Coordinates of C-alpha atoms in Angstrom, one line a residue:
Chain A
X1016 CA -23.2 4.0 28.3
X1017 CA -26.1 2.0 27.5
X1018 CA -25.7 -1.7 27.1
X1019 CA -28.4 -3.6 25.0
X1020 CA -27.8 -7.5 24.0
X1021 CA -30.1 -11.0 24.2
X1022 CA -28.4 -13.8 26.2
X1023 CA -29.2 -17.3 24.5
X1024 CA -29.7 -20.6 26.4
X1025 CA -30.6 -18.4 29.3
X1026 CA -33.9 -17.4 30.3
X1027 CA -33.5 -15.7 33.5
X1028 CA -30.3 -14.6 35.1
X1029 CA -28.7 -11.7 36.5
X1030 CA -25.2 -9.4 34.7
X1031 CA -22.6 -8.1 37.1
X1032 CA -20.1 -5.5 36.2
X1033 CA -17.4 -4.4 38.6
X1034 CA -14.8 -2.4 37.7
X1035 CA -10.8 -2.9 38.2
X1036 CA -9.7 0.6 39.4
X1037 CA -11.1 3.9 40.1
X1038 CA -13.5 5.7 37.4
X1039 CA -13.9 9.6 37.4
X1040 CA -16.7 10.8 35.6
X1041 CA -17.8 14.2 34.1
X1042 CA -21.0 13.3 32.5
X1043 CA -22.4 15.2 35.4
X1044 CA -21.4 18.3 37.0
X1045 CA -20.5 17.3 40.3
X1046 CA -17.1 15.0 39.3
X1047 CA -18.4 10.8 39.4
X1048 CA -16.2 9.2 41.7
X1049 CA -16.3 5.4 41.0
X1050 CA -15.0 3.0 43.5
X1051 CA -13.6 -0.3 42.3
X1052 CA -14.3 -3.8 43.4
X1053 CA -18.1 -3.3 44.0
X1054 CA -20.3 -5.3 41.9
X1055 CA -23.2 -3.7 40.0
X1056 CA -26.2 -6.3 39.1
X1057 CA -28.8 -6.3 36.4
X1058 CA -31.5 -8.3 35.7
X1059 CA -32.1 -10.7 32.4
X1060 CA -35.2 -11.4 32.0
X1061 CA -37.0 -13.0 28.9
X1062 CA -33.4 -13.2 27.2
X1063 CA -32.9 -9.7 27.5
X1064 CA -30.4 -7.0 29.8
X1065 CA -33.5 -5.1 31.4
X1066 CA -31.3 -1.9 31.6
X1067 CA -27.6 -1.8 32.0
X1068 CA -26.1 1.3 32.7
X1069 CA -22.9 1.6 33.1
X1070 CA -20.2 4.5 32.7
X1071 CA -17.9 4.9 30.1
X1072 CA -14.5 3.5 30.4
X1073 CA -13.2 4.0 27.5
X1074 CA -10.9 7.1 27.4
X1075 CA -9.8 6.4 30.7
X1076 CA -8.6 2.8 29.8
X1077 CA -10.4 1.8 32.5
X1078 CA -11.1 -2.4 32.4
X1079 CA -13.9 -4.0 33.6
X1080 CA -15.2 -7.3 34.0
X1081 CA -18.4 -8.3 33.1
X1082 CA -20.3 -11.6 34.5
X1083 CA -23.4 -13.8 34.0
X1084 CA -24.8 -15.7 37.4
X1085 CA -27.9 -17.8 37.0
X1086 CA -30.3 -16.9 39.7
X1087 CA -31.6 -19.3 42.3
X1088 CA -35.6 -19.6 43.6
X1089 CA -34.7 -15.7 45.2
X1090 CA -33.2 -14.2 42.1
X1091 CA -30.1 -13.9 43.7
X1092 CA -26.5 -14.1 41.4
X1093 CA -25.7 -17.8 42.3
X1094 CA -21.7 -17.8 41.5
X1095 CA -20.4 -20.2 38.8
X1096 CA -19.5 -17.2 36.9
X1097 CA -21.1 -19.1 33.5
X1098 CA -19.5 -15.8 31.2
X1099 CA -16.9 -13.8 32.3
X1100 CA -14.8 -11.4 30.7
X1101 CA -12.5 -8.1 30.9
X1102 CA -13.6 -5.5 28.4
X1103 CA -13.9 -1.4 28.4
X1104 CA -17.2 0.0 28.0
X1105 CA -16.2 2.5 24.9
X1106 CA -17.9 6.1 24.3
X1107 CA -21.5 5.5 23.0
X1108 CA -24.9 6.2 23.6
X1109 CA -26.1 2.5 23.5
X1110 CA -24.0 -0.6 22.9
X1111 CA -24.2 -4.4 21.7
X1112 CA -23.1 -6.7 24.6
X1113 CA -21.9 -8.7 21.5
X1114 CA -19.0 -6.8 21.0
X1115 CA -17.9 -6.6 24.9
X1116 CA -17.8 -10.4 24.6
X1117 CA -14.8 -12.4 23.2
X1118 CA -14.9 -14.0 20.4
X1119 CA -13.0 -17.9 20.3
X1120 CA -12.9 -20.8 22.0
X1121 CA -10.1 -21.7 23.9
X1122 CA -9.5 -25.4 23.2
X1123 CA -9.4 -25.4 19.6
X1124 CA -7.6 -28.2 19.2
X1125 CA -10.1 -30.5 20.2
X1126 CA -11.9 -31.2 16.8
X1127 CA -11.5 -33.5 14.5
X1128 CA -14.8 -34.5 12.8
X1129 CA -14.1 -36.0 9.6
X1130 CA -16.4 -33.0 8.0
X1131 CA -13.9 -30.6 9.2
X1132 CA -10.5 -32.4 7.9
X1133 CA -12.2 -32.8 4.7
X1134 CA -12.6 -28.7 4.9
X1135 CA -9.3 -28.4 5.4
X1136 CA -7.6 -31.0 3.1
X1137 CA -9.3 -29.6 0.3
X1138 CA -8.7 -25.7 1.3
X1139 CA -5.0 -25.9 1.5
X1140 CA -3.5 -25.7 -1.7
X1141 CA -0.6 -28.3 -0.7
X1142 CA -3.4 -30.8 1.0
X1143 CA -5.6 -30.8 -2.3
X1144 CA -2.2 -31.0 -4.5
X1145 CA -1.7 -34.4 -2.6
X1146 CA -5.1 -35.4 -2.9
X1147 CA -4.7 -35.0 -6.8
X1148 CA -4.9 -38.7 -9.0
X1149 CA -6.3 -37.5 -12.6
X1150 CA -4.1 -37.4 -15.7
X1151 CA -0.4 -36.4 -15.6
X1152 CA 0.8 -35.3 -18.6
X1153 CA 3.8 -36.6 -20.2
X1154 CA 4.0 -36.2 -24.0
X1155 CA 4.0 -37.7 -27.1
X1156 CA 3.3 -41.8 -27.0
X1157 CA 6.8 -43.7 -27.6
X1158 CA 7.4 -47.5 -26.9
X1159 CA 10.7 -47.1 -25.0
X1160 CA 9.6 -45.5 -21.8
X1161 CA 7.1 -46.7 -18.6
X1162 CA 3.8 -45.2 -17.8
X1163 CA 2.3 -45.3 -14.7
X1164 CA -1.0 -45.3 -13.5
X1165 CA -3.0 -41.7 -14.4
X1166 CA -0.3 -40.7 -16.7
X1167 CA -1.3 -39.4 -19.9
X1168 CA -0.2 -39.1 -23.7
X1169 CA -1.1 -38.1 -26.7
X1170 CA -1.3 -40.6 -30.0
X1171 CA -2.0 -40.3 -33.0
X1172 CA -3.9 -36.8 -32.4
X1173 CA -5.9 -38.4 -29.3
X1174 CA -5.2 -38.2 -25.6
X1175 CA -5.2 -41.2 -23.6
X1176 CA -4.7 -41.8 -19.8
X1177 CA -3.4 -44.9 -18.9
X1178 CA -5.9 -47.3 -16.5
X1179 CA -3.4 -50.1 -16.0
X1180 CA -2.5 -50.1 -11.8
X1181 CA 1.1 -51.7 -13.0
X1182 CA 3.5 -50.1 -15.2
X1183 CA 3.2 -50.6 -19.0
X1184 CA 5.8 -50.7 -21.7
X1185 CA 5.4 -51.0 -25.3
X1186 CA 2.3 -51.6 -25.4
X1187 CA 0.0 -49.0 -27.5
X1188 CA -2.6 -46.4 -26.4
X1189 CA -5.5 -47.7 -28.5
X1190 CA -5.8 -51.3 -26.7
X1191 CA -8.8 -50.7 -24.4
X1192 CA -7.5 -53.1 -21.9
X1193 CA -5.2 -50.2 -20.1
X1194 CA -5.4 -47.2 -21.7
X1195 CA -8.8 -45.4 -21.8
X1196 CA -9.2 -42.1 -24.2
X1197 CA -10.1 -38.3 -23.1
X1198 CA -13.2 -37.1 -25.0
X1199 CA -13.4 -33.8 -26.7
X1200 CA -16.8 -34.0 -28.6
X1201 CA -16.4 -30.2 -30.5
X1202 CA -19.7 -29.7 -32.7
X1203 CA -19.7 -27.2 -35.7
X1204 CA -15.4 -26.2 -35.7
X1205 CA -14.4 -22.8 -36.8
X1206 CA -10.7 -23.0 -37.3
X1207 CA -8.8 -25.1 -39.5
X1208 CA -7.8 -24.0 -42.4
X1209 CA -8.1 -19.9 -42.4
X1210 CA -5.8 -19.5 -40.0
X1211 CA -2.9 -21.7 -41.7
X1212 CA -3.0 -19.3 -44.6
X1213 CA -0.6 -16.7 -44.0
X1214 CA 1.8 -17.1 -47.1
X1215 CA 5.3 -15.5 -47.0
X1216 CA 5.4 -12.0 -49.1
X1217 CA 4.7 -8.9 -49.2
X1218 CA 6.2 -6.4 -46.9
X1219 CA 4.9 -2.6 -48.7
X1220 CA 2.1 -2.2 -51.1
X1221 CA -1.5 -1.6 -51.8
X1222 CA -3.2 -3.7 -54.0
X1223 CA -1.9 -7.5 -53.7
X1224 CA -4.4 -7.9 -50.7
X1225 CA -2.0 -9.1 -48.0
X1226 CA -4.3 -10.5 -46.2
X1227 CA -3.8 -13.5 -44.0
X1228 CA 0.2 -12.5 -43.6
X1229 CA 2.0 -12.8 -40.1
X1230 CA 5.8 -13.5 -40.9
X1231 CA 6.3 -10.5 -43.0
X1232 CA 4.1 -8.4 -40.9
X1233 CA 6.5 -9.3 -37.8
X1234 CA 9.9 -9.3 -39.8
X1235 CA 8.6 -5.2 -41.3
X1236 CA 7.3 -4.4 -38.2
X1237 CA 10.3 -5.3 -36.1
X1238 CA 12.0 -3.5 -38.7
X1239 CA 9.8 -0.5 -37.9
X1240 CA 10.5 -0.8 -34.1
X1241 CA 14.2 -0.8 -34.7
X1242 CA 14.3 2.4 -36.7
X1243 CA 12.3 3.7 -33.9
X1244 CA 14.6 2.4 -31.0
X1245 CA 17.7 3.5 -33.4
X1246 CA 15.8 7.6 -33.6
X1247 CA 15.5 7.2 -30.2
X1248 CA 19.2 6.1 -29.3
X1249 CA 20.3 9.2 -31.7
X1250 CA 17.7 11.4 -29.7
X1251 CA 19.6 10.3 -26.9
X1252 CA 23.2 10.5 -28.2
X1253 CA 22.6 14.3 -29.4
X1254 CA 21.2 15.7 -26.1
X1255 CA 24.1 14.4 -23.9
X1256 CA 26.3 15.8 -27.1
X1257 CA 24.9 19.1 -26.7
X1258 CA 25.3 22.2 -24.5
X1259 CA 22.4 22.9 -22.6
X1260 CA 20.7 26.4 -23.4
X1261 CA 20.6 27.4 -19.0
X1262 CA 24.2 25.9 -18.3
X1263 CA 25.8 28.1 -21.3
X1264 CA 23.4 31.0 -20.4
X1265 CA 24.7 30.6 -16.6
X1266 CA 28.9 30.3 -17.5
X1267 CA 28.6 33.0 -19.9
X1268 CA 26.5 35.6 -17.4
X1269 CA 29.5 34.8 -14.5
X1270 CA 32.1 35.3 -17.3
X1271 CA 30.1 38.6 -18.2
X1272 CA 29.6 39.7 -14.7
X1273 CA 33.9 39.1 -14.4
X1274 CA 34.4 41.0 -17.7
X1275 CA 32.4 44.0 -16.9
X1276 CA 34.3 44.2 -12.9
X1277 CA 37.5 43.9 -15.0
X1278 CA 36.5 47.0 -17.1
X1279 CA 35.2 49.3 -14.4
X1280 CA 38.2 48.8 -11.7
X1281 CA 41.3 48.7 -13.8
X1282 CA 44.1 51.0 -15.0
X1283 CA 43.7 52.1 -18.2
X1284 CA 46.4 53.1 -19.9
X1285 CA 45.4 56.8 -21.3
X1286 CA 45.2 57.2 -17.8
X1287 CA 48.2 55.9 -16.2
X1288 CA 50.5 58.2 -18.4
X1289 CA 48.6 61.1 -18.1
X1290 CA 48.7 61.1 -14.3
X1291 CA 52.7 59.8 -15.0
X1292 CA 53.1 62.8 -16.7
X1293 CA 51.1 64.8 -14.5
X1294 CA 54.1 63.2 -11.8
Chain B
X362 CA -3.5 -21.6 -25.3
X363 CA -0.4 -20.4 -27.3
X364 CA -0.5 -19.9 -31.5
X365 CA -3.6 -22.0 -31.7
X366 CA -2.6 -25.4 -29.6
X367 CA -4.1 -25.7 -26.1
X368 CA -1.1 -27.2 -23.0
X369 CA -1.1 -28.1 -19.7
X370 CA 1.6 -27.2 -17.3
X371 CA 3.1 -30.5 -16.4
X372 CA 6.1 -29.0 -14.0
X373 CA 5.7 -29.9 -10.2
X374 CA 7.2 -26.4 -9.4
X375 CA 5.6 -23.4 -11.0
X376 CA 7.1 -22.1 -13.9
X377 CA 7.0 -18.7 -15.7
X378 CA 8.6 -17.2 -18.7
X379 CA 8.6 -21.2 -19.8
X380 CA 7.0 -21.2 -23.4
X381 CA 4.8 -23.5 -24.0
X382 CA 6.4 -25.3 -26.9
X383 CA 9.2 -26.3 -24.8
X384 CA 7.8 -30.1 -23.9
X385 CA 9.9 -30.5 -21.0
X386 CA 7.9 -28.5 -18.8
X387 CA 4.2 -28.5 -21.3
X388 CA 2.2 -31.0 -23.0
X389 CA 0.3 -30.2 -25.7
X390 CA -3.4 -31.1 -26.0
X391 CA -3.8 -32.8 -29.3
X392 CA -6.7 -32.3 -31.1
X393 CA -7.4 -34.3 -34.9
X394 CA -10.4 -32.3 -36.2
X395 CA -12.1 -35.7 -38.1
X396 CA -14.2 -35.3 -41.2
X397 CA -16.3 -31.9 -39.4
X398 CA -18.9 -30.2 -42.1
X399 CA -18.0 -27.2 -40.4
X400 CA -14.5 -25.3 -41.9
X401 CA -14.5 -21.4 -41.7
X402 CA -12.5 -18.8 -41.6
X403 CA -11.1 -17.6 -38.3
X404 CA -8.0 -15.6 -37.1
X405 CA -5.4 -15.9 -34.0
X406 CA -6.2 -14.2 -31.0
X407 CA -2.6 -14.2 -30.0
X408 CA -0.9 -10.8 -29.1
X409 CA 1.8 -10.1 -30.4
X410 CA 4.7 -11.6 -28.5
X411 CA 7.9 -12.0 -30.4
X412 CA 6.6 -15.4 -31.1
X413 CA 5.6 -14.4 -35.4
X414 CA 9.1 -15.1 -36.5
X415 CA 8.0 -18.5 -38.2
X416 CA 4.1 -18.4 -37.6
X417 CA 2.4 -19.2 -40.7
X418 CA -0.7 -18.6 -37.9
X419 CA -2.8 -15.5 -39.5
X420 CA -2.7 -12.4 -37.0
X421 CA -6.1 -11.1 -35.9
X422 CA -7.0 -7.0 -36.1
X423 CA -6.6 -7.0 -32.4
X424 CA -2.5 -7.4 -32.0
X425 CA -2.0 -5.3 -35.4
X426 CA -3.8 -2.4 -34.1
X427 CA -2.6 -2.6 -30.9
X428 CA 1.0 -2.6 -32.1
X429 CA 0.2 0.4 -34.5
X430 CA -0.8 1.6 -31.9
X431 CA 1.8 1.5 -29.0
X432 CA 4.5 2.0 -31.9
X433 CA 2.6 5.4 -32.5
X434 CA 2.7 6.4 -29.5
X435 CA 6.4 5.8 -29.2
X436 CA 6.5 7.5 -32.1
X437 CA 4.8 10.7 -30.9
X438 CA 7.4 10.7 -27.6
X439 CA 10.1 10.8 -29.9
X440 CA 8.5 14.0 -31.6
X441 CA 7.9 15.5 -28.6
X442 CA 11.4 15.1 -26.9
X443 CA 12.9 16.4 -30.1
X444 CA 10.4 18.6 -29.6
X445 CA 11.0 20.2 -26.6
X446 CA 15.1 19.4 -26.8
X447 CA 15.2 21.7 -30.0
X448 CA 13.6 24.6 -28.0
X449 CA 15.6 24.2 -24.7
X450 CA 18.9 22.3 -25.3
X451 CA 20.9 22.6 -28.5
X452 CA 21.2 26.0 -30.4
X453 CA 24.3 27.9 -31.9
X454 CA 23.8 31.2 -33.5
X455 CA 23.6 33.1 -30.3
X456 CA 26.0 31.4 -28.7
X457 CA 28.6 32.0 -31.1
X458 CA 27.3 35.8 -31.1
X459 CA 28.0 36.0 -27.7
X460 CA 31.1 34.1 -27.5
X461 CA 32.3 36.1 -30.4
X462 CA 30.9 40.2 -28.7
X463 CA 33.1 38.6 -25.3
X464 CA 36.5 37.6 -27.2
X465 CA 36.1 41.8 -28.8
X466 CA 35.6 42.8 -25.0
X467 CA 38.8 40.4 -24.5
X468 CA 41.1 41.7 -27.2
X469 CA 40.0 45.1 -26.1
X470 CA 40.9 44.6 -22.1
X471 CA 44.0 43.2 -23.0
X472 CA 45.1 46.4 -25.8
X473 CA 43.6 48.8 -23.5
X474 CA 44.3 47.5 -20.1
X475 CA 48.2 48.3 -18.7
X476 CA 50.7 45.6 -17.7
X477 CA 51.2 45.6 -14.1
X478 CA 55.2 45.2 -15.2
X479 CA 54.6 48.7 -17.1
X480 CA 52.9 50.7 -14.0
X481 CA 56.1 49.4 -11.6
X482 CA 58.5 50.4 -14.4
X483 CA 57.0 54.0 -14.9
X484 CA 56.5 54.1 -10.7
X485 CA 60.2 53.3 -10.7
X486 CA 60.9 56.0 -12.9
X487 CA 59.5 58.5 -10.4
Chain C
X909 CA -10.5 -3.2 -32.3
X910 CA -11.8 -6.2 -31.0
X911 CA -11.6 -9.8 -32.2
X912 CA -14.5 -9.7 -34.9
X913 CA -12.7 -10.6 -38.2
X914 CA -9.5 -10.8 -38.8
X915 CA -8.5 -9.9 -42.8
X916 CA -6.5 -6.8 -42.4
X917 CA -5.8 -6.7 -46.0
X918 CA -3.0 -4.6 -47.9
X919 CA -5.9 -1.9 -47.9
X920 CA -5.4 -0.3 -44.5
X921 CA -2.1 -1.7 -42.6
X922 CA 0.0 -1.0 -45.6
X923 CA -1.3 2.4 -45.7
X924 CA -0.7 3.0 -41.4
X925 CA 2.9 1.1 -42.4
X926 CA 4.1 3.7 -44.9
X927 CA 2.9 6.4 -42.5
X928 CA 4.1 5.2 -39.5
X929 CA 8.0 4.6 -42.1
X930 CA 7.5 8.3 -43.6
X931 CA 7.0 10.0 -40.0
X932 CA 10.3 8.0 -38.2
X933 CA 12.1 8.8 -41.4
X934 CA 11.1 12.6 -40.6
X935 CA 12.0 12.0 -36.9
X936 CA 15.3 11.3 -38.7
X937 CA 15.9 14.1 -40.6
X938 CA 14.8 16.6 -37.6
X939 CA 17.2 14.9 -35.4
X940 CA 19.8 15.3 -38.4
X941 CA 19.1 18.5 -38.8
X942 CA 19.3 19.5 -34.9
X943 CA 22.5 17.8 -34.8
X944 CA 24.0 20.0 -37.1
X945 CA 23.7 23.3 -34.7
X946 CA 25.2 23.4 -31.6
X947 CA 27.8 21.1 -29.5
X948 CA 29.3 20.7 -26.1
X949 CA 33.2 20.0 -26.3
X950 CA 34.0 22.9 -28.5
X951 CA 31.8 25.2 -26.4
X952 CA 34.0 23.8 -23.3
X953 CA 37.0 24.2 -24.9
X954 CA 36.6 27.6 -26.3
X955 CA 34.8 28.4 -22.9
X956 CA 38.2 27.7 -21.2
X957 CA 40.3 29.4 -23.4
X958 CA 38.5 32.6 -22.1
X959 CA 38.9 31.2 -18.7
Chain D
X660 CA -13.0 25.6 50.7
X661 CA -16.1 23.7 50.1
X662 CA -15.5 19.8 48.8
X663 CA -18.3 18.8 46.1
X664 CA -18.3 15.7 44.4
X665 CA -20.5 12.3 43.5
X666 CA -19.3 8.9 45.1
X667 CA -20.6 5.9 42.4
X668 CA -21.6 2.5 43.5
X669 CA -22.3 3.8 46.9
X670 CA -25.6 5.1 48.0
X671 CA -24.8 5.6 51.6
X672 CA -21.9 6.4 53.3
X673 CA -19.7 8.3 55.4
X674 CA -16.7 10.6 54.3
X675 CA -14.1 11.1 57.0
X676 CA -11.4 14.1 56.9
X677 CA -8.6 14.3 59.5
X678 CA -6.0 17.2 59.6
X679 CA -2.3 15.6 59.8
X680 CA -0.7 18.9 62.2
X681 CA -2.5 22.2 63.7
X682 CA -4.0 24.4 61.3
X683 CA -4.5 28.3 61.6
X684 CA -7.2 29.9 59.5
X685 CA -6.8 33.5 60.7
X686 CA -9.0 34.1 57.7
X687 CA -12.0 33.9 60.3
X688 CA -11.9 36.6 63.0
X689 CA -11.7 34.5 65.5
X690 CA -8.7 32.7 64.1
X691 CA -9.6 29.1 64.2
X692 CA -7.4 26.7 65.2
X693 CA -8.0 23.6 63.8
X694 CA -6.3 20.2 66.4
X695 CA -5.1 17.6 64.3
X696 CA -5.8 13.4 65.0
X697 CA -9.6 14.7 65.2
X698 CA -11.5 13.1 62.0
X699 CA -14.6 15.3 61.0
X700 CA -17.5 13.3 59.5
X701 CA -19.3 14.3 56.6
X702 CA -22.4 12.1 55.1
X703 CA -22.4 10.8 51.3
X704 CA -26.3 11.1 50.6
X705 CA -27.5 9.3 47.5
X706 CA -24.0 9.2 46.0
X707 CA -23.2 12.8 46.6
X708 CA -21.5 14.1 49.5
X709 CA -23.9 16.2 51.5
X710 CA -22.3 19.8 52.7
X711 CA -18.1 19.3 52.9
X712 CA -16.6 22.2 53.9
X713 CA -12.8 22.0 55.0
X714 CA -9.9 25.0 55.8
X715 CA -7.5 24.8 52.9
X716 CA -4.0 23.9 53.7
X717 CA -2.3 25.0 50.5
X718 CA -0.8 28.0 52.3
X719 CA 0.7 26.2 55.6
X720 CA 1.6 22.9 53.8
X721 CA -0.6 20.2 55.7
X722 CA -1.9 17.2 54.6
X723 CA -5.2 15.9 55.2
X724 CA -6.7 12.2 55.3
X725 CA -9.5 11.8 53.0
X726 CA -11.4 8.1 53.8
X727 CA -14.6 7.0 52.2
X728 CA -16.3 4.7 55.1
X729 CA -19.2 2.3 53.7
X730 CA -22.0 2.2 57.0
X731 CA -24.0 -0.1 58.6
X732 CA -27.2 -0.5 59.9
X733 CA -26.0 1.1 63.6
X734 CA -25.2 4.3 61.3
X735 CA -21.4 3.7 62.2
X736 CA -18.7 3.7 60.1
X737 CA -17.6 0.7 58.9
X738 CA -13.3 1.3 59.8
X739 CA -11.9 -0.6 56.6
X740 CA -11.9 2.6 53.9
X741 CA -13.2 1.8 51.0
X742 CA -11.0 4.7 49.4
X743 CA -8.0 6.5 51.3
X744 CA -5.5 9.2 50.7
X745 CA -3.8 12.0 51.7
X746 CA -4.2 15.4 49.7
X747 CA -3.6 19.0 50.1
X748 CA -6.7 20.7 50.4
X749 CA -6.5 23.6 47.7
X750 CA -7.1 27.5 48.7
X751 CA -10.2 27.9 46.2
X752 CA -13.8 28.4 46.9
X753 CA -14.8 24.8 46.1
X754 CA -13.0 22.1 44.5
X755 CA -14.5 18.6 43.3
X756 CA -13.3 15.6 45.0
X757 CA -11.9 13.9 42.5
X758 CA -9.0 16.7 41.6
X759 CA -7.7 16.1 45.2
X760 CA -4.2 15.0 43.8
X761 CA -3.1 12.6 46.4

């Protein structure tokens, strides 16, 4: 298999791969024996595996570590091991030396950069549930109960959220001084009046133009649905009443298959006297 | 938004199958409407819900025709089970035909057939 | 369908009403009807009388 | 039997056979008796073992030592194996190295 990859912050180093037990190969026709423990090098040059050859491991399960040396003034692997890690060269013409690589860092519990807990308090539904403020609702204005800072009522057909950072009592919604009003601002309204029409008649008929009805349209049609539900409880009640057409069709074939063995291999009684009297 | 008033969910824990007139768990968004030049007519884009028993809201084509139309489809099951019960459950004329040619075939066994206590009598008389 | 006007005048629900009332109430007379024919306890019975 | 086979990661080295008790092939004429304790070298050329040819033991039940030895410049066998086993050598023609079941 064909490895291919870049290698960043690296201009010039060298790629070692020795494998962890013995490889047998049939690429080729004489049978690859590969020995384990011996270290394979590469160069990287400009940033880039020259060429890396190295056999397929992969159905064989075969592990095999892979390492990065910088290279000293001979271009020799000096050995601080900068990358190394395990992997199996799968079955493919040419591969990513991405993917051979882990992924993850192993102390990841070393950040905390302000940035990041800000990611993190808002992401988490409990976090950002904490981190709420804003109104809370709690109904209709009344001058026997405490409101606390953020909550807000309604009055008078207006919403209000109360400012005041001490609890207030008694005192109303529309003084500025610690309640503060939620603006709506709708231009150019569409319903108001249309849809309070409705009017209560009018269940069956054609030309009193029951129009904007809903109460009598729900109390006929539930009447509908219950003439429906009662056909269908009848439907029910008459086919576990019933016979059923295969079940009377099977008891009266056995009964019929009985009868005619009764017939054929009995004693008749023409026959019984006749032989009597033949006695 | 429920029957034309907008509410806000003011239950810590979530809730569900909570209607929204119930103001334990809801507030409702109050709304005056002051003076506006604009009043038209609209409907009620609510489906229908069980929620029309007193509603003097006006019901938009939308929930009509889709409970026309779910009630004619229940409707058209109906048909069809009677449909195909009539022709493969419940029928009578042939049965009682049948049952009536097998009590003849019974009647006749019985007349025609001997008693086992005859044969042993007329065997004893030999 | 759709949520373009809303009228829905004693023009054409009334008329989908009375059909939708006519065709249960001939669901109703079928099933009446096919509850007349047949049954299952007197078939049993008489069945095991044969028996 | 004739041992064929490829040896990776090695591009020199010596392969060493060595019969564990005496042999008989009286498939030559002149029967040949092959001593045991005796190990017969063989050269792994370019990572291919050059001509291995070895009297099967399938039929009298012998084992035989197969070493891999790497080699340095004196041309001698460097003792420490980088590979060793014990196998029966199969009564076929040839056989690849690597289905030598030790």
């Amino acid at each position: 298999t064909n490895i291919v990859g870049r290698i960043g912050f690296l201009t010039t180093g060298k790629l070692g791969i020795k494998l962890r037990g013995v490889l047998i190969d049939e690429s080729t026709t004489p049978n690859t024996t590969y020995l384990p423990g011996i270290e394979s090098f590469f160069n990287i040059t400009a940033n880039v595996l020259t060429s890396v050859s190295y056999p397929e491991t992969e159905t064989q399960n075969v592990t095999a570590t892979f390492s990065i040396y910088s290279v000293d003034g001979s271009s020799n692997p000096v050995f601080p091991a900068l990358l190394s890690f395990d992997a199996i060269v799968p079955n493919v013409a040419s591969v990513e030396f991405d993917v051979l690589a882990p992924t993850g860092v192993v102390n990841n519990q070393l950040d905390t950069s302000a940035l990041r807990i800000a990611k993190i308090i808002a992401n988490d539904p409990a976090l950002a549930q904490k981190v709420a403020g804003a109104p809370y609702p709690r109904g209709a204005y009344s001058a026997t109960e405490t409101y606390l800072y953020g909550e807000m009522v309604s009055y008078f057909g207006k919403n209000y959220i109360s400012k005041s950072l001490s609890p207030i009592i008694n005192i109303l919604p529309t003084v500025t001084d610690s309640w503060y009003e939620l603006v709506i601002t709708l231009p150019e309204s569409v319903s108001v009046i249309a849809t309070g029409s409705d009017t209560a008649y009018g269940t069956g008929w054609n030309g009193s133009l029951l129009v904007p009805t809903q109460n009598a349209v729900y109390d006929k049609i539930v009447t509908v649905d219950a003439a429906i539900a009662t056909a269908n409880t009848n439907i029910t009640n008459l086919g576990t009443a019933k016979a059923d057409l295969s079940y009377v069709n099977t008891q009266l074939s056995a009964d019929q298959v009985v009868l005619d063995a009764l017939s054929s291999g009995k004693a008749d009684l023409s026959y019984v006297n006749t032989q009597l009297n033949s006695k």
